[PDB]
Amino acid sequence: PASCHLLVSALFSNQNLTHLCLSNNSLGTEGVQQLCQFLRNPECALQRLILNHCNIVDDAYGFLAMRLANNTKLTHLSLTMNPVGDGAMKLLCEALKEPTCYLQELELVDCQLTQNCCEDLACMITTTKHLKSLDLGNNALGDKGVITLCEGLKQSSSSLRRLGLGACKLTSNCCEALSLAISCNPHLNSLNLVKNDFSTSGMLKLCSAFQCPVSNLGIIGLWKQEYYARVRRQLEEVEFVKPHVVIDGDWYASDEDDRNWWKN
């Protein structure tokens, strides 16, 4: 934290650094405050900022939300294995709801989440106009949470493209709402559903939703070995109907934009 504070203070005067990555290193509250102060300084020109597995305090979430309320030239942000409460989630989605947001991508995989904040998530999705990619991971949204999310999605005001759900403890009930939302979602492009229990009838419903001409879902991440013969035949029929649909287990392999510049 002292080293991080010194590094940020030194970087305060810099203006030619666009991409910055800091992961797995403990960061103090004062470090986050100094980083936000640097971001508020003009001529920063820092597009992508990546932070994972670095503990972030509740007050730092306030600073981040205040920056996000009036933010430019800051497109991609990542937060993973970070303790984020439901109230912090509400604060973040309220900050995103403001029209002066240019954040294209937001990643929140292992942040502990519950079903209560899902209504505010649906509201912010409906209101937001610039969010393109949204990802969720091991956080357990819950059946009611996914139902509310799909109710917000089916209205289809949002122009988001990529949605990611994995090990969210899904059931067969939300599949009807998901199919209904997809059936009127020409904008949606990519989708993932892995490590979630899906019954046979849910698979038929989802395949039928895929086959509808309105849906334009191209990238889909599922494991074909888990399902029965009829589901495999239906997916083959989907591939026959649309020549540009590909189903592969490794969903993260596909990159529409440079996301693993730091990983390489």
Place this chain on the structure above:
Amino acid sequence: PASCHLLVSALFSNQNLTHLCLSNNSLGTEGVQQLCQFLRNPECALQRLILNHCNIVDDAYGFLAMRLANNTKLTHLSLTMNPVGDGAMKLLCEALKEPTCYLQELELVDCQLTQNCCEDLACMITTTKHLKSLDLGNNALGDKGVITLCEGLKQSSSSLRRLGLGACKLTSNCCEALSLAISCNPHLNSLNLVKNDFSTSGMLKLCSAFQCPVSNLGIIGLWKQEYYARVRRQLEEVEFVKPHVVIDGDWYASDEDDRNWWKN
């Protein structure tokens, strides 16, 4: 808290209330969020808001801080005997440092505060151009924290008029720092120093500070029965040189503007 959400939701269409007061009522986090959401829209036209004993904790401070950062036509805010943190105070100072803020007076009487937040307060006082009255009560600023404040006070760039330090754990050692600040501070007009212990020698320095022609201070909150006979003669000498000065123990009796309308 359920009842409070109904009023602000109903008031969302109101264009009448300029003064609103609440006290000694349990208030939930969601009520503050909607209340902050209430002021988010235009045509709120609400000037003063008082919430003394309402329990405001954690993200609700962040909700207010985000709103206050880009806010206007909200001049008076009061919080008293409601718990705030030193970090939460740091968050508020950053919002107040923004040029887009017209909040005139701010009161935190029994809110818990320490020496660490004093340095951030000192930076805020110099840069702020719209804050006039700052009130600090039972919070223990300490000797070191106060000395930090006088450095910003000494620089005299601030235009604040009324400052209140009652039961702020002042001592004899810090008497030197205050005397220097009062020596060069033409803008300061009203001051409060009650329930604080000062050295007989230090008060001899403080009394000499009042007699300085540079000082333009008119209202002093002090109890003449507390101090030494020689000091009393010096105190009487202050009134002799400057006939316009008033020394009275009851500091809250004087009202430049309406502050006890709810108490009336």
Place this chain on the structure above:
Amino acid sequence: DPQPVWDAEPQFCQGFLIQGLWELFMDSRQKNADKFLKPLSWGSEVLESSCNQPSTALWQLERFTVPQALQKVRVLKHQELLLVVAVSSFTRHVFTCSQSGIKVWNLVNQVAEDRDPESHLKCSVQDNKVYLRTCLLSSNSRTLFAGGYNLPGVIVWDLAAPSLYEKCQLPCEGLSCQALANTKENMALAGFTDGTVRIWDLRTQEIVRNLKGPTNSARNLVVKDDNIWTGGLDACLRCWDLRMAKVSLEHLFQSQIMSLAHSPTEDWLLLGLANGQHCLFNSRKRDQVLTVDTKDNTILGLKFSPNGKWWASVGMGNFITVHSMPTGAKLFQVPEVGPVRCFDMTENGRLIITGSRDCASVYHIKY
């Protein structure tokens, strides 16, 4: 409504070319894109590329890896229902155990369907009626164990010698080998129907210790250098240390116990009950047992990962389920048509073998 569809599995390029050449000859004598699975390279690895991850791991935590999906590569054919399988990753020799006969196969050769084994071993030739139920392998791959119901003893085969031969009969005439066990020590362990456990030394072939309990309590047995665990129909749970030679803990359940498991890197004990409840217990603090997973179907087999992160279950309901240790939640699913009796795992963590019906199947793990 499973409606399952079956297709040739490997679709190997060599097989495709051979099939193509075969058709041309038939066409000549008659007058009178494509997807192929990667072969098992040398019988050791598949040589695939790993899958991407959302974020990088910690510098200290590189070794921890978890699987995603299972893919089958080969099918092993035996006309009779198989009961147990063995991996022997060091020698690339898979052993298949059935009620009547045992066969040995090698994974070097590439073929879709394997019908000809490298070695065929039957215990029914020696005696009039031989029913086999249990089998076991040693880590050093120097011994092979096979127990039977009416077979008077247990036969040991050694793979170090150039030829396979029987070491010792080690008779148990009145006792049927319901349970067979072995340890790092040379010492042999076995359980039988009548609640009796008799113990022999391989070097000298003598009975050294006998244990007695209520009937049906020897259905399960867990071996450790300082821990012997025993339970059955009674559901009493007993942990024994040979050193001070006394039962350490007694535990009671509402139903019978069938499946037990242990973790190498740090002790955890897994319990499988008749009503389908998975109970986890730690053998260090020794305080309390807890259950986190429930399955409607009865669970018959269980196994743990060498890394110490995931465990896969095989049960009556024709399902394969794999979980994780932090929460017990399942992470991927692969069902099969037949009731899966057995299960297996590899020390390297690259292959996996499971068998339900008369024939056996070999799967490949992806990381």
